[PDB]
Amino acid sequence: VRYFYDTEFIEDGHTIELISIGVVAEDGREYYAVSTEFDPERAGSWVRTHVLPKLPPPASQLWRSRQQIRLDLEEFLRIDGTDSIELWAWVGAYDHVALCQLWGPMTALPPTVPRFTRELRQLWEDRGCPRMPPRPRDVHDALVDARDQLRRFRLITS
Ligand X SMILES: Nc1ncnc2c1ncn2[C@@H]1O[C@H](COP(=O)(O)O)[C@@H](O)[C@H]1O
Binding-site partner at residue 113 among Mg ion, ligand X, a second copy, none, CB < 5 to 8 Å by type: none
Binding-site partner at residue 15 among a second copy, ligand X, Mg ion, none, CB < 5 to 8 Å by type: a second copy
Q: Which is nearer to ligand X, 27 or 138 (CB)?
A: 138
Contact at 8 Å (CB) between 67 and 76?
no
Burial of 158 (0-12, 13-18, 19+ CB in 10 A): exposed
Q: Is 67 in the site for Mg ion (CB under 5 A)?
A: yes
Over the range 98-130, which residues count as b (16 or more CB within 10 Å of their CB) and which as e?
A: bbbbbeeeeeebeeebeeebbbbeeebeeeeee
Q: Is 131 in the site for a second copy (CB under 8 A)?
A: no
Helices (H), ranges, 14-141: 45-50, 66-76, 93-100, 120-126
Contact at 8 Å (CB) between 109 and 103?
yes
SS3 state of residue 144 = helix
Q: Which is nearer to a second copy, 13 or 57 (CB)?
A: 13
Q: In the bound complex, what is the minimum distance in angstroms from residue 7's beta carbon to a second copy?
A: 12
In the shown chain, the binding pattern of residues 1 to 40 toward ligand X, with x for contact by CB under 6 A and - for none, equals -----x-xxxx-----------------------------
Residue nearest Mg ion by beta-carbon distance: 67
Task: Please enumerate, by residue number, every residue annotated as part of a binding site for Mg(2+).
Answer: 6
Q: Which residues bind a second copy (CB under 8 A)?
A: 11-16, 44, 46, 91-94, 96-97, 100-101, 103-108, 115-119, 121-123, 126
